Amino acid sequence: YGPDQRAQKKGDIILGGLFPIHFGVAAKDQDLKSRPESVECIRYNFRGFRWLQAMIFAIEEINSSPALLPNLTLGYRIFDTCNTVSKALEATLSFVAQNKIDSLNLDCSEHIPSTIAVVGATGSGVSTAVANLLGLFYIPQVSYASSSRLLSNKNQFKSFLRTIPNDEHQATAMADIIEYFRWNWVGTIAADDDYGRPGIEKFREEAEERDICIDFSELISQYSDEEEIQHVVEVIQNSTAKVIVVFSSGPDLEPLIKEIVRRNITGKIWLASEAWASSSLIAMPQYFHVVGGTIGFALKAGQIPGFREFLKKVHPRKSVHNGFAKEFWEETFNCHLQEGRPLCTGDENISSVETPYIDYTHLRISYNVYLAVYSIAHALQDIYTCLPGRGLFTNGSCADIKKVEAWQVLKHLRHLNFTNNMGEQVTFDECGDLVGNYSIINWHLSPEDGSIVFKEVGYYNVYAKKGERLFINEEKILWSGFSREVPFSNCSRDCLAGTRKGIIEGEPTCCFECVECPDGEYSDETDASACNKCPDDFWSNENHTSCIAKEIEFLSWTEPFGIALTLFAVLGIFLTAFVLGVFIKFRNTPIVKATNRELSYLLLFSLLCCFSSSLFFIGEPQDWTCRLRQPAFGISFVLCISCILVKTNRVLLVGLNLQFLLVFLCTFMQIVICVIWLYTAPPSSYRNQELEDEIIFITCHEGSLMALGFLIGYTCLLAAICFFFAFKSRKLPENFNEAKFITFSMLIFFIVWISFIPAYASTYGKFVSAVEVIAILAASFGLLACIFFNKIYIILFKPSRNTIEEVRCST
Amino acid sequence: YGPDQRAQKKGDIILGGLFPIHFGVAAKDQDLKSRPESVECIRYNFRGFRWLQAMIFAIEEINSSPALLPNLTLGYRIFDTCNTVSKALEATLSFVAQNKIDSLNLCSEHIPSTIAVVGATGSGVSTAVANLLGLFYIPQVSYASSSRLLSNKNQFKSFLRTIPNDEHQATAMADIIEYFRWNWVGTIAADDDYGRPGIEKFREEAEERDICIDFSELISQYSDEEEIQHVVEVIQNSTAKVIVVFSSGPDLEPLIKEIVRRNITGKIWLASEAWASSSLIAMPQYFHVVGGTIGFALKAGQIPGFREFLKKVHPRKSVHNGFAKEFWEETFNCHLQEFRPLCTGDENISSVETPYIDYTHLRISYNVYLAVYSIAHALQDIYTCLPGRGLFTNGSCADIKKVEAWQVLKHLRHLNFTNNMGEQVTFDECGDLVGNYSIINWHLSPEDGSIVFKEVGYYNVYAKKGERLFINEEKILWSGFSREVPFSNCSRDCLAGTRKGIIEGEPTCCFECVECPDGEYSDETDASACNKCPDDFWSNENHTSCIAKEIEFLSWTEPFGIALTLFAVLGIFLTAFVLGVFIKFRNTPIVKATNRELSYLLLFSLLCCFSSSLFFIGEPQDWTCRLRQPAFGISFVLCISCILVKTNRVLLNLQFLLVFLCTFMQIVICVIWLYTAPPSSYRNQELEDEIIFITCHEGSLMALGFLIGYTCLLAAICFFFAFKSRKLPENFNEAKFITFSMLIFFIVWISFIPAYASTYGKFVSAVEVIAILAASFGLLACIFFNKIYIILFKPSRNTIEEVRCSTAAHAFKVAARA
Ligand SMILES: *[C@@H]1O[C@H](CO)[C@@H](O[C@@H]2O[C@H](CO)[C@@H](O)[C@H](O)[C@H]2NC(C)=O)[C@H](O)[C@H]1NC(C)=O
Ligand SMILES: *[C@@H]1O[C@H](CO)[C@@H](O[C@@H]2O[C@H](CO)[C@@H](O)[C@H](O)[C@H]2NC(C)=O)[C@H](O)[C@H]1NC(C)=O
Ligand SMILES: *[C@@H]1O[C@H](CO)[C@@H](O[C@@H]2O[C@H](CO)[C@@H](O)[C@H](O)[C@H]2NC(C)=O)[C@H](O)[C@H]1NC(C)=O
Ligand SMILES: C[C@@H](NCCCc1cccc(C(F)(F)F)c1)c1cccc2ccccc12
Ligand SMILES: C[C@@H](NCCCc1cccc(C(F)(F)F)c1)c1cccc2ccccc12
Ligand SMILES: N[C@@H](Cc1c[nH]c2ccccc12)C(=O)O
Ligand SMILES: N[C@@H](Cc1c[nH]c2ccccc12)C(=O)O
Ligand SMILES: *[C@@H]1O[C@H](CO)[C@@H](O)[C@H](O)[C@H]1NC(C)=O
Ligand SMILES: *[C@@H]1O[C@H](CO)[C@@H](O)[C@H](O)[C@H]1NC(C)=O
Ligand SMILES: *[C@@H]1O[C@H](CO)[C@@H](O)[C@H](O)[C@H]1NC(C)=O
Ligand SMILES: *[C@@H]1O[C@H](CO)[C@@H](O)[C@H](O)[C@H]1NC(C)=O
Ligand SMILES: *[C@@H]1O[C@H](CO)[C@@H](O)[C@H](O)[C@H]1NC(C)=O
Ligand SMILES: *[C@@H]1O[C@H](CO)[C@@H](O)[C@H](O)[C@H]1NC(C)=O
Ligand SMILES: *[C@@H]1O[C@H](CO)[C@@H](O)[C@H](O)[C@H]1NC(C)=O
Ligand SMILES: *[C@@H]1O[C@H](CO)[C@@H](O)[C@H](O)[C@H]1NC(C)=O
Ligand SMILES: *[C@@H]1O[C@H](CO)[C@@H](O)[C@H](O)[C@H]1NC(C)=O
Ligand SMILES: [Ca+2]
Ligand SMILES: [Ca+2]
Ligand SMILES: [Ca+2]
Ligand SMILES: [Ca+2]
């Protein structure tokens, strides 16, 4: 036979089942000093007993109806695995015992029944160990809870089927949930078995595609010792990540949760996989301050109508075929059953004690057990109603229901398609898998009772296009059980505008510093990895949020220095017009006729042009003022020097009038120099940007310096010749000491235009035009004063008629 | 009973063996009235047959020996697994058939008992065998399974191995990668219990050492076309040149064939131990892809009679080996009687080159040898146990006539023996050994063209962390032909004037280089932050190091300051000479006529005016700049007052009062200016970045205004009262010269107005100095240079009447009108 505690019943066709009635086995490390005994199972599991009852209720309901398998009863043989590979293998060796006597040729009870199909285990490692042995004899195994991706491999597992989705959609959904709430800094914890490792590897692969940085990654187990648990707890406690993604079940997560609760570590955001998101080992009222507000996945519910009334009929004396009912009665009512702790009577009421057996709201894994039994029954009904010539075997032949074999049932299970009680269609794919939606739940705290309440906050729709599968209603979520604000789980705070992301070495790419943008660059947005250089005509604001236009610099009108220069120029023009009016008003008087009368008019006109030529420097330096600011002053002032130079004594030793030829031939050189310079290479405007970054100047580009050198040197040469021929005869008393005044005027010229040299070599912006204008007006006021003011003071001032006569002029 | 072909011999105690005599099975499916028949194994493995011969040789050598297990013979039942789980479980069901009948109470009545099994090769196979053998506590010693998941003794109760596990090898891969300074790799692992935990341990160790991983893929022996195309696309879309592979030969052969048929060259392959010596991959047709591979190997051992036993195999004389017949058929390509030609029993096995006798080193064969001798020494410990000293309950001993499998497992846990090379064998608490690694490189034989595995280093697991690796870099050919180490970084290194910059969406190993701005620098290679060096320093034009900003001031050892100091010294040693020749000629006539005591005070004030020029040279400090300008102000107002007062005044000594008042009225100003807003030194850094200007901040400007203004006023009035007497001939026409001097003053302090406003804050001090040393000379000359001549070049002209009316003007003799 096999294990002695079982639920079995005879029939024409026998099914097999494997359920965890205990949570684990007793902790005993054997030292092998004596022959090893059988291990004992410890903690009773009411949920697994309900799953076993779901299988038995399905079998009895199928045998009741006359439409699903007429005149042919099903039987069963069900064992207990205790979530352990070894006990499951001791059961599976009894399943395959008749097949294996044939294959190993041992020929001896000869009344051993044969098992057609087995309802599978809950854990993936247990399912792999059972599947390796059931695939040898082609016995089909349908699992209700194993969801590892490794069991989709049909090269290794030839006869495995399941009614639960595999876990790739769940890890993708976890990555989508993390992307929805805009986190990037997470930690991961998985169980060290075939369920946790592929799930957490698939989560890691999906997480690096979405730029989510994982801080830590640790493995746990039910049989971890103490120092591994303090290593994992110290890894959790050292990290700044708040969101932790866990692939585990209840038994593998319980020691870690107990040690975290003992140290009272709060503030973490847990992401549960489906195995522990509804686990009564973890959803405890005294753990809540650690595990409140846990967000998890759940399967879709289903309706089994007469099931609760079947569940309330269990009894130790009336369940002859069920052998697990006795310990159920003992563990519910805390008594001892004395077959024929206080002593039981067998009369107690199941509703009086609250256990997970009938305290439930939805049926989720129990529905998978129900559907597995109906899948096997509709495969056998497909065999029963097969028509000759239309079968699934050679030449369209049909199997015999009276001598059916397991490989033919597996063949009909691969081509299976049927409608359940809820109206949906059930079909397995080529990998032997089934697909379904997910519900998304949150852990709350009951106000009526003080216990944990699972509230649905969203769904995950697996038939939708990628990136459109998640729905979450955020207004129904209490973070950490009580808070209404979404928590912060990034590595570092976001950089603002005006700054830039900087690397921290040895750390992942989600962790950065915020460095301010440099002097000439902005940053427009938040979380900028670079600073953008501002355009040529604009310079960055001090805030560095955005940049504004530069400041243009030029000496201008409507400026409190240019107004002063303009008023001085107008005063000079008014003075020259006054002197011209005085000379015209008395032109038959001897003082003006003793001087050359026809020649002073050109002198006064040249002084008028010299005053008016200084206005070209003031203002915005356009193109046609840079071309005429120097030649106008050059020509006008050389005309002035020539008109001075003719009227000196002893400089006319050698046409109709013979004094204007000297003036014409001395002005003609400046005229031709200006014409050839302005023809070969004219000056231009120039926007100067290389002196200061913040401001730009508007200046005049000269074009050449050879022609400007000639145009200054010729004027200095004429000034030197006139100064020589005036200083040589300075003692002559004629014309009211005129040669002395010519000497003083040329001296003032040379002092001003030597003393204004070092302004040019040092100043660079507005001040150059200022010192040019001040120099021009200073030189021309000096020349006008020194030539004419003594003559004016004699003509009309208080010595009016006394010193005006011709006999006084040369005395 | 069980599988049909087997190697089988009987004795007192029966062992068991699982070896991969084939490489795999053939493919089929589709139960369309196939009552499913047994599947066929396809490709013959000569290395696995050598491994099977090692076990038989060890058993026969023990049975010949009188020192180990006397009067007790060992036996064997050995099966073929074909590297698949299902054949191994078919054989293991035959191992445990007797213990099974005791359990389920379910016969042949002649089933022998197996007490130990020499284990499987693949970790996926050994896991499935160990799950069923641990039910009955039958020990299982494996020779090649190296997955870390088999170290878990809560699940695998009776598992031991004579090979080390793969934690050290996965750490050693990251050590080798960190040795050659690469940080940008890709990983490939098989999809089973050997590849996935090894590559996960490597990923953890690589992320600990700041090594970035670009891709990570999984392959299998049963991958279809599209998965291989996807992996090849992933490989040749990447710039990483180093690929780390955890796989065996059969799981890697399809991928290698697809890479070979495309010319994908230049990759650097890092081999794990299972495929670094595989004959399926190390072939001459693949050398342009897999040449230059660097891989791991175990330590070799000696079996001193194994080759002559290997050359003794015959199909008709090996009556206890059922696998010899297919060996003979597959070697000489013939058919044995009981189209390919007929065999004779007369061939020499030294002709055909197969992996059977063509090896250099025994590595896994030595592990099979040790796995047999471990079981033999545990049974020897059972046989030589003294009562009172046993490992069981009351110090009792096991019975050798009626031994049980759990008792052999108990002695296997407490084993410590010494092997044939004088080293100690013992298992730890997880049932493991530890051992060194050899590091090999793939080369090309110049004599034949086959692939040679050349040792280039070792990995020592008994050393401490960080000192376990020795690599001789001179012996490596890098793709089989190259002598330079490849480049396998994501991006190039940044230079001395640059820092790193983030590429958004890419890992930390992929960056940009951005130059440091003005004022910062960098000096190392990978900077990631520019540095601002401290105050009064500015960066170079290279942004490598920063140099010191130079300070700018009128210095003493600068030659311009030397020239100005020599003009000052000439001025003082001119006025001192004037003072000396005045003191010698006091009572002479043309000296007593100018109020001789005012001349001495005038020269004292003028010497102070010369000496006030030296306060403007040097680095400006607090005590110097506060006394720069008031010294010149007081000295010059004393000069102007002494020049002004010596013209004759009838009413309003009782004359010096004036010379008091006219200076006192400025002294007070100076006082107030130093007691409400004194000037100070000031470093002005904002004009030029690379130049530090040191100058003065002059406090309140208004005060200075006042100062200057007063001076000027008291000059002007003097000028006027000199000019009014300009045509009055007395004192060699003194008045005129006074006027001239005053004019000079004015001109010198007017024409220096633009330059003072031009270089202000940069080089104004020099300007000032020049102005002073022009004005002072003016005074001196124009006042007291005319008389000197008549003092000491024309004697007997210094008479009284000349002071009244002078015949010869001279005026220096006009310098003799040179
Ligand atoms: C935490 O980090 C994430 C990712 O780094 C930030 O989310 C990004 O925000 C910007 C601006 O709104 C979007 O353009 C990106 O698409 C977001 N990323 C994702 C993946 O959605 C998030 O803003 C950060 N949270 C806080 C509080 O700073
Ligand atoms: C593992 O490898 C190390 C490194 O070669 C071995 O240590 C050396 O052994 C040789 C030969 O006995 C000595 O000459 C050296 O001095 C040893 N040390 C070093 C640092 O090279 C070690 O013996 C090997 N272990 C085993 C068990 O073989
Ligand atoms: C590839 O990258 C690595 C690490 O980013 C560089 O290794 C550094 O090399 C320098 C000099 O060779 C050492 O000073 C550093 O200590 C190394 N860093 C580490 C972490 O080991 C390597 O130089 C790069 N290779 C090339 C060619 O640029
Ligand atoms: C208005 C005045 N401009 C002098 C520019 C000097 C300069 C500035 C920059 C570069 C150069 C250089 F190219 F010559 F070096 C020279 C000017 C104009 C015309 C005649 C003049 C005759 C006598 C005195 C002044 C004259
Ligand atoms: C040494 C000198 N320091 C300030 C010169 C300013 C200035 C620069 C250029 C021109 C002028 C002036 F024309 F206005 F004088 C003044 C100084 C100190 C104290 C008294 C002074 C009296 C007269 C002159 C200089 C005086
Ligand atoms: N999916 C889990 C089994 C499982 C699902 N739901 C559960 C609820 C309780 C316990 C286990 C489970 C596995 O693969 O092993
Ligand atoms: N270590 C491999 C087995 C192995 C080691 N060396 C080998 C050489 C050839 C083939 C297989 C192997 C495993 O765990 O599966
Ligand atoms: C965690 O932090 C503690 C204290 O800073 C430190 O000693 C320890 O090394 C860190 N890491 C782990 C794994 O405990
Ligand atoms: C645990 O933490 C909570 C905070 O939520 C605190 O109120 C309580 O006192 C703590 N208990 C212990 C035992 O530290
Ligand atoms: C299953 O049967 C229904 C009934 O019409 C059909 O619509 C559906 O396509 C079938 N499914 C498969 C996979 O054949
Ligand atoms: C999955 O969910 C969507 C909407 O949430 C629903 O329309 C669909 O029918 C669900 N799938 C199944 C199989 O019920
Ligand atoms: C820019 O700086 C000013 C300070 O004057 C501040 O008022 C303003 O808010 C800043 N602009 C921003 C932050 O956009
Ligand atoms: C590889 O690169 C090509 C071209 O760059 C691209 O079209 C293709 O999608 C890539 N494939 C993968 C698997 O990345
Ligand atoms: C593959 O590349 C090599 C160069 O390394 C070349 O010699 C060879 O011809 C290529 N293979 C084929 C089939 O062309
Ligand atoms: C094994 O035995 C030798 C002596 O026989 C001893 O030196 C050595 O320490 C032993 N090893 C262990 C692990 O006990
Ligand atoms: C440093 O600058 C000098 C000249 O300024 C140049 O010659 C030299 O090459 C630079 N050094 C570098 C670029 O490493
Ligand atoms: Ca029925
Ligand atoms: Ca790091
Ligand atoms: Ca012997
Ligand atoms: Ca990316």
PDB file of C-alpha atoms in Angstrom, chain A residues 1-2 30-36 85-86 89-90 93-94 100 104 106 108 129 132-133 136-138 149-150 155 192 197 201 204 211 219 392-394 405 407 411 414 500-501 503 505-509 529 755-756 758-759 762-763, chain B residues 1-2 31-36 85-86 89-90 93-94 100 104 106-108 128 131-132 135-137 148-149 155 191 196 200 203 210 218 222 391-393 404 406 409-410 413 499-500 502 504-506 508 528 751 754-755 758-759:
ATOM      1  CA  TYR A   1       0.000   0.000   0.000  1.00  0.00           C
ATOM      2  CA  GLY A   2       1.789   3.075   1.287  1.00  0.00           C
ATOM      3  CA  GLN A  30      19.585  13.142  12.546  1.00  0.00           C
ATOM      4  CA  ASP A  31      23.102  12.089  13.516  1.00  0.00           C
ATOM      5  CA  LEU A  32      22.495   8.525  12.224  1.00  0.00           C
ATOM      6  CA  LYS A  33      23.432   6.787  15.480  1.00  0.00           C
ATOM      7  CA  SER A  34      20.452   4.455  14.952  1.00  0.00           C
ATOM      8  CA  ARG A  35      18.232   3.400  12.053  1.00  0.00           C
ATOM      9  CA  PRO A  36      16.305   6.455  10.807  1.00  0.00           C
ATOM     10  CA  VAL A  85       9.422  16.370  -1.413  1.00  0.00           C
ATOM     11  CA  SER A  86      10.099  13.089   0.421  1.00  0.00           C
ATOM     12  CA  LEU A  89       7.610  10.830  -3.354  1.00  0.00           C
ATOM     13  CA  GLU A  90       6.482   8.132  -0.906  1.00  0.00           C
ATOM     14  CA  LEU A  93       5.776   5.538  -5.493  1.00  0.00           C
ATOM     15  CA  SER A  94       2.437   4.027  -4.510  1.00  0.00           C
ATOM     16  CA  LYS A 100       6.559  -0.160 -12.532  1.00  0.00           C
ATOM     17  CA  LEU A 104      11.042  -3.719 -14.171  1.00  0.00           C
ATOM     18  CA  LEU A 106       8.851  -8.344 -11.160  1.00  0.00           C
ATOM     19  CA  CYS A 108       2.934 -10.048  -6.218  1.00  0.00           C
ATOM     20  CA  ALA A 129       9.851  15.985  -8.093  1.00  0.00           C
ATOM     21  CA  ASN A 132       9.857  13.578 -13.034  1.00  0.00           C
ATOM     22  CA  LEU A 133       8.429  10.237 -11.907  1.00  0.00           C
ATOM     23  CA  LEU A 136       8.041   8.055 -16.930  1.00  0.00           C
ATOM     24  CA  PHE A 137       4.743   6.161 -17.131  1.00  0.00           C
ATOM     25  CA  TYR A 138       2.779   8.917 -18.963  1.00  0.00           C
ATOM     26  CA  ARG A 149       7.788  28.826 -15.503  1.00  0.00           C
ATOM     27  CA  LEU A 150      10.147  25.823 -15.375  1.00  0.00           C
ATOM     28  CA  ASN A 155      10.891  18.257 -23.158  1.00  0.00           C
ATOM     29  CA  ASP A 192      15.292  29.824  -2.293  1.00  0.00           C
ATOM     30  CA  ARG A 197      14.126  32.325  -8.096  1.00  0.00           C
ATOM     31  CA  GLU A 201      14.823  36.820 -12.151  1.00  0.00           C
ATOM     32  CA  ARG A 204      14.835  41.854 -12.526  1.00  0.00           C
ATOM     33  CA  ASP A 211      15.081  52.241 -15.574  1.00  0.00           C
ATOM     34  CA  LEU A 219      17.218  34.860  -0.491  1.00  0.00           C
ATOM     35  CA  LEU A 392      -7.676  10.734 -32.055  1.00  0.00           C
ATOM     36  CA  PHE A 393      -5.632   7.562 -32.629  1.00  0.00           C
ATOM     37  CA  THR A 394      -4.428   5.648 -35.715  1.00  0.00           C
ATOM     38  CA  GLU A 405      -4.967   3.667 -20.192  1.00  0.00           C
ATOM     39  CA  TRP A 407      -1.550   7.891 -22.067  1.00  0.00           C
ATOM     40  CA  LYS A 411      -3.912  12.504 -25.326  1.00  0.00           C
ATOM     41  CA  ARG A 414      -4.279  17.862 -24.735  1.00  0.00           C
ATOM     42  CA  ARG A 500      22.668  69.599 -13.544  1.00  0.00           C
ATOM     43  CA  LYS A 501      23.067  65.925 -12.681  1.00  0.00           C
ATOM     44  CA  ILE A 503      27.896  61.313 -11.070  1.00  0.00           C
ATOM     45  CA  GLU A 505      31.251  57.025  -8.330  1.00  0.00           C
ATOM     46  CA  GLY A 506      30.593  53.455  -7.234  1.00  0.00           C
ATOM     47  CA  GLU A 507      26.811  54.030  -7.141  1.00  0.00           C
ATOM     48  CA  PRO A 508      24.115  53.183  -9.726  1.00  0.00           C
ATOM     49  CA  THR A 509      22.788  55.612 -12.296  1.00  0.00           C
ATOM     50  CA  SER A 529      21.908  65.860 -17.407  1.00  0.00           C
ATOM     51  CA  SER A 755      48.267 114.856 -23.345  1.00  0.00           C
ATOM     52  CA  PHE A 756      45.398 112.875 -24.909  1.00  0.00           C
ATOM     53  CA  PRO A 758      47.306 107.646 -23.020  1.00  0.00           C
ATOM     54  CA  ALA A 759      43.505 107.759 -23.042  1.00  0.00           C
ATOM     55  CA  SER A 762      44.014 102.214 -22.186  1.00  0.00           C
ATOM     56  CA  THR A 763      40.287 102.952 -22.517  1.00  0.00           C
TER      57      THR A 763
ATOM     58  CA  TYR B   1      16.080  -6.980 -14.480  1.00  0.00           C
ATOM     59  CA  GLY B   2      15.899  -3.320 -15.437  1.00  0.00           C
ATOM     60  CA  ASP B  31       0.685   9.988 -28.950  1.00  0.00           C
ATOM     61  CA  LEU B  32      -1.528   9.153 -31.967  1.00  0.00           C
ATOM     62  CA  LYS B  33      -2.024   5.514 -30.868  1.00  0.00           C
ATOM     63  CA  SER B  34       1.625   5.266 -30.045  1.00  0.00           C
ATOM     64  CA  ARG B  35       1.501   3.402 -26.854  1.00  0.00           C
ATOM     65  CA  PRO B  36       4.746   5.231 -26.138  1.00  0.00           C
ATOM     66  CA  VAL B  85      16.611  12.461 -16.388  1.00  0.00           C
ATOM     67  CA  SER B  86      14.282   9.679 -17.550  1.00  0.00           C
ATOM     68  CA  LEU B  89      15.235   7.423 -13.041  1.00  0.00           C
ATOM     69  CA  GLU B  90      14.631   4.120 -14.848  1.00  0.00           C
ATOM     70  CA  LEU B  93      14.207   2.540  -9.734  1.00  0.00           C
ATOM     71  CA  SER B  94      16.208  -0.655 -10.241  1.00  0.00           C
ATOM     72  CA  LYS B 100      10.830  -0.379  -1.928  1.00  0.00           C
ATOM     73  CA  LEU B 104       4.946  -0.404   0.325  1.00  0.00           C
ATOM     74  CA  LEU B 106       4.092  -5.125  -2.141  1.00  0.00           C
ATOM     75  CA  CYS B 107       8.249 -11.118  -6.132  1.00  0.00           C
ATOM     76  CA  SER B 108      11.523 -12.266  -7.651  1.00  0.00           C
ATOM     77  CA  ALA B 128      16.500  13.758  -9.648  1.00  0.00           C
ATOM     78  CA  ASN B 131      15.579  12.929  -4.486  1.00  0.00           C
ATOM     79  CA  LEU B 132      14.801   9.211  -4.766  1.00  0.00           C
ATOM     80  CA  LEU B 135      14.268   8.389   0.735  1.00  0.00           C
ATOM     81  CA  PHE B 136      16.152   5.196   1.617  1.00  0.00           C
ATOM     82  CA  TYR B 137      19.383   6.840   2.910  1.00  0.00           C
ATOM     83  CA  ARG B 148      25.551  24.836  -5.272  1.00  0.00           C
ATOM     84  CA  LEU B 149      21.912  23.735  -4.850  1.00  0.00           C
ATOM     85  CA  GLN B 155      16.768  18.325   0.931  1.00  0.00           C
ATOM     86  CA  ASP B 191      18.873  26.718 -18.774  1.00  0.00           C
ATOM     87  CA  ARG B 196      21.541  29.510 -13.708  1.00  0.00           C
ATOM     88  CA  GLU B 200      23.609  34.463 -10.750  1.00  0.00           C
ATOM     89  CA  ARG B 203      26.305  38.622 -11.590  1.00  0.00           C
ATOM     90  CA  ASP B 210      31.694  47.876 -10.699  1.00  0.00           C
ATOM     91  CA  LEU B 218      19.673  31.490 -21.886  1.00  0.00           C
ATOM     92  CA  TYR B 222      16.502  21.895 -27.552  1.00  0.00           C
ATOM     93  CA  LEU B 391      30.096   5.580  15.863  1.00  0.00           C
ATOM     94  CA  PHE B 392      26.706   4.098  16.787  1.00  0.00           C
ATOM     95  CA  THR B 393      24.688   4.205  20.028  1.00  0.00           C
ATOM     96  CA  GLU B 404      23.100  -1.387   5.779  1.00  0.00           C
ATOM     97  CA  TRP B 406      22.756   4.330   6.327  1.00  0.00           C
ATOM     98  CA  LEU B 409      26.620   6.989   5.036  1.00  0.00           C
ATOM     99  CA  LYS B 410      27.508   7.527   8.714  1.00  0.00           C
ATOM    100  CA  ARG B 413      30.434  11.611   6.853  1.00  0.00           C
ATOM    101  CA  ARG B 499      35.192  65.321 -16.441  1.00  0.00           C
ATOM    102  CA  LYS B 500      32.548  62.662 -16.984  1.00  0.00           C
ATOM    103  CA  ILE B 502      25.848  61.283 -17.907  1.00  0.00           C
ATOM    104  CA  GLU B 504      20.555  59.326 -20.000  1.00  0.00           C
ATOM    105  CA  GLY B 505      19.181  55.783 -19.942  1.00  0.00           C
ATOM    106  CA  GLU B 506      22.542  53.971 -20.176  1.00  0.00           C
ATOM    107  CA  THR B 508      27.322  54.099 -15.262  1.00  0.00           C
ATOM    108  CA  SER B 528      33.638  62.946 -12.483  1.00  0.00           C
ATOM    109  CA  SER B 751      47.510 118.115 -18.484  1.00  0.00           C
ATOM    110  CA  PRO B 754      43.131 112.516 -18.595  1.00  0.00           C
ATOM    111  CA  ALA B 755      45.842 109.930 -17.832  1.00  0.00           C
ATOM    112  CA  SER B 758      42.565 106.646 -17.743  1.00  0.00           C
ATOM    113  CA  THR B 759      44.700 104.108 -15.845  1.00  0.00           C
TER     114      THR B 759
END
